[PDB]
Amino acid sequence: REQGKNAQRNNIEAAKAIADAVRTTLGPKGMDKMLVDSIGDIIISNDGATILKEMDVEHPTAKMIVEVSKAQDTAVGDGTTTAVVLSGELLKQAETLLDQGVHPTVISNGYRLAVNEARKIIDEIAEKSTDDATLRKIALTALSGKNTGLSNDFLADLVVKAVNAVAEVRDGKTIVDTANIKVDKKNGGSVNDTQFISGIVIDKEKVHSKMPDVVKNAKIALIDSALEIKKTEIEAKVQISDPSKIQDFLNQETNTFKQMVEKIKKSGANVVLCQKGIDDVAQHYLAKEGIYAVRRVKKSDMEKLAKATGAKIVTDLDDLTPSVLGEAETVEERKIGDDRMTFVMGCKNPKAVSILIRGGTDHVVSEVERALNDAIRVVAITKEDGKFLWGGGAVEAELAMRLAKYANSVGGREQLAIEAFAKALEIIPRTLAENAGIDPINTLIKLKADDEKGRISVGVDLDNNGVGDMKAKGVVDPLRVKTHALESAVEVATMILRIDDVI
């Protein structure tokens, strides 16, 4: 148990630490971490949430900072590093106000004021635009400090395209259900070989060799149950008194599978995607019937497939009518890499696409996937929000400048508190610079002035080796991410600030 000062400074020290663990992954010139467990083993990533979910955090307070990365990730997709680094800085900056005598609460109130205020300035200075031109920009930037190769422009384009292909419009606004974009990956070396499939890809093979290698104009039946011999819920026993029956019983079994197949054929279905298993005799006849079957299909998939082809997931083959079959121009098995996979294309419903990721190693494909997800999520958000911000320290520098001014128009103690939040915001520019290997302080000094002269969009230009116009370079931060990062950070910073005794 720790009381007062001990507890607090200690808590701020904990948060600060966990926060630095990811600090170097920020921005373009970011680095990666290598986490190794006991069995699975090596995991190499640049993703904030990953490096932390996998990290073995022990200190309670540190566990709380980790919580924000997992939230940032699942709630907004991008920004996990930022929210962590920011929480570390708000807690750190507060430690000064604390030593001077300012009460944790008023500090918590300053951060409220400040964040609520910033939550307006950004929305004030946010830049609207929904054209593919910028959607592409959001993408390029979301893929920066990541090990994706030189293909980023290619990847950005895949993402913009996938988002646009699934973006629907309802009562006036555009919605993008990221769930309609199925991303997968396969070791085969390339990264450029990343295919954009206008359909649903299933990492599965057809169950039986003789089944059609491809099926055009397919009537797709999704099945909940396993095409196998079922047993009655009430224990049963078979008493054979006549030798003859021993065969008859063995036949019932066969005729059972024959009928299952018959029900299936009768519906018109020529493609059977089974969430569960398929018996070898069932397979014999499905093949004899010429139906393309796939067993043990992932429920996640069973669902996407249902949505993409318009089919109804049926359990009781007795309710397998033509009415519940899905549609796809082609259902074809094709060998992607060492693996054979089932391609379902021309789905009744077009708002369902895939991104089959390729790349080599393994360790490179997983991450490229992680990078492509951040990109997919933010491009999607931006598609909906139609607003964005000036990246690379720009937004922050501005917010900091304005907030330090708003500070003066506030009380004594709270001012001190909001000036603290203003500085905390400068942590991003400083970080991007530090990692790039440039001079934090001067970068900041220069960045302040340019933004002060009204140059909203001057960010940290690693290329120009200092400050520069993010407008030109096209570095844009999506709105929703900034805000959740800021709000998440303030809520968690406050939580920790009030803890005066940990037991």
Partner: protein
């Protein structure tokens, strides 16, 4: 002698662990159990119910917390602070050979008088019910980290209780089983909202069920939808290979018929506490029935009251009279997850509050903080009166007890006066926690109250001793009477125990 000395100290220790959380400059506690579970909160009942206390006296002090929590809902940190006062004071009296029986009587008498005073200095809630209740809700939120949004949370707290509150004999009654409170992370605090209906954190049991049903006939089961195996040792004997399919069909029919019954009675939604067989799932789905499963019993009851349903545990006898009603049931994604919202309930005195917090541990406190408000505006509403907060009423009771002491004179008087000093613990804590000088504020506090300023408390923000009802810091009368009640009952118990053995 010693057993007592030791007990009193152990007790006072628990008190202090909670003292710093009292008021608007209150601090919070972080609690990490053996399993590594972390609870970062301000709620004294939680801080208490949570901590690992071993000394029996300490457990007894914690017994206080839960009880104050139980009856009223707000004021558990207050009760504890007083119990420590009384004990620390009795510690002095005990040194002067004042018998623990005398101290217990004196404490008892003072207590009685203390509750009288609160009734006296109280104030009936007039036509200002709205803003009065709002002011109450807020003061509650002021101590919690929810202050950030006390204005919105207080309106919600006020709105929610006002809704489920039945004004019977010109008197209100609030059944909390009409206020469903759910917490879902991934949204800011300000995002907390009031949903007319009962939200259940459960999504539909099968991909094929509809996302929305309008004018729903809610069938509530407390039994699982599955084939019923007899109670006697039953076995199927198949001697003919043909029977095998006949049996399997019969078993599917039984499930297909359960669904038929529920459907036949006009059920539109099937919310069950238990499980739904996979095959039965197909059927409901096919019938167009929106069905959820393995639902929380507590929730089951709330859906009942709301929709006017009846929890059928015998599907075979599910009658149409057993169906609940709701204008619409729909699956909605609340951030990450999918929730089922039963809106437009048959019974409009049922509502839900969806607490939003960006983080798990954040939304958890947010949920605790709101429950505190609900219990307050509710308790206030019911009681009908309120007392001025900020230590005003405490300083008042302290004032009046010093007089009564002079009346009921003797050794009793020594105990009655100590009881007064102990009640003064609140103003001291409140002041201390902010940064105000306790002894100075306490002296000024006594002055005003002497001069009949029954509502002068500590404005912890300005540091001045102002009018508490004016500045709006007020609390239900019920909170104050119990704290003093629970507090004196602990002090008396610990005070009679002269030996503690195994």
């Amino acid at each position: 002698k010693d057993a007592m000395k030791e007990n009193i100290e152990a007790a006072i220790a628990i008190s202090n662990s909670v003292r710093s959380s009292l008021g608007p400059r209150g601090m919070d506690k972080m609690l990490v159990d053996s399993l590594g579970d972390i609870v970062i909160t301000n709620d004294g009942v939680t801080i208490l119910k949570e901590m690992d206390v071993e000394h029996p006296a300490a457990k007894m002090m914690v017994e206080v917390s839960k009880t104050q929590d139980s009856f009223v809902g707000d004021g558990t940190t207050t009760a504890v602070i007083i119990a420590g006062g009384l004990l620390q004071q009795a510690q002095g009296l005990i040194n002067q050979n004042v018998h623990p029986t005398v101290i217990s009587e004196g404490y008892r008498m003072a207590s009685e008088e203390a509750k009288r005073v609160i009734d006296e200095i109280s104030t009936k809630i007039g036509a200002d019910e709205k803003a009065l209740l709002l002011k109450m809700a807020q003061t509650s939120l002021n101590s919690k980290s929810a202050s950030v949004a006390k204005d919105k949370l207080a309106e919600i707290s006020y709105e929610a209780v006002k809704s489920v509150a039945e004004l019977r004999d010109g008197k209100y009654y609030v059944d909390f089983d009409n206020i469903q409170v759910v917490k879902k992370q991934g949204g800011a605090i300000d995002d907390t909202q009031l949903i007319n209906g009962i939200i259940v954190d459960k999504e539909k049991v099968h991909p094929g069920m509809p996302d929305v049903v309008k004018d729903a006939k809610i069938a509530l089961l407390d039994a699982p939808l599955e084939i019923k195996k007899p109670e006697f040792d039953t076995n199927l004997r198949i001697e003919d290979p043909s029977m095998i399919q006949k049996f399997l069909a019969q078993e599917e029919n039984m499930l297909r018929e359960m669904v038929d019954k529920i459907k036949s009675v006009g059920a539109n939604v099937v919310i069950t506490q238990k499980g739904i067989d996979d095959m039965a799932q197909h059927y409901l789905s096919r019938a167009g029935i929106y069905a959820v499963r393995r639902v929380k019993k507590s929730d089951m009851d709330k859906l009942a009251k709301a929709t006017g349903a009846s929890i059928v545990s015998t599907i075979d006898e599910i009658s149409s009279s057993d169906l609940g009603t709701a204008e619409r049931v729909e699956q909605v994604k609340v951030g990450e997850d999918y929730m089922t919202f039963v809106t437009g309930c048959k019974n409009p005195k049922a509502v839900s509050i969806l607490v939003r917090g960006e983080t798990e541990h954040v939304v958890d406190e947010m949920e605790r903080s709101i429950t505190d408000s609900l219990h307050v505006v509710a308790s206030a509403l019911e009681d009908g009166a309120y007392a001025a907060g900020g230590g005003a009423t405490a300083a008042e009771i302290a004032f009046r007890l010093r007089s009564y002491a002079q009346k009921i004179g003797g050794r009793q008087q020594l105990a009655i006066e100590k009881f007064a000093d102990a009640i003064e613990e609140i103003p001291r804590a409140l002041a201390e926690n902010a940064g105000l000088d306790p002894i100075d504020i306490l002296l000024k506090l006594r002055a005003e109250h002497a001069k009949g300023n029954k509502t002068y408390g500590i404005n912890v923000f300005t540091g001045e001793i102002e009018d508490m009802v004016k500045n709006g810091v007020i609390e239900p009368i019920r909170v104050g009477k119990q704290a003093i009640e629970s507090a004196t009952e602990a002090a008396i118990m610990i005070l009679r125990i002269d030996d503690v053995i195994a």
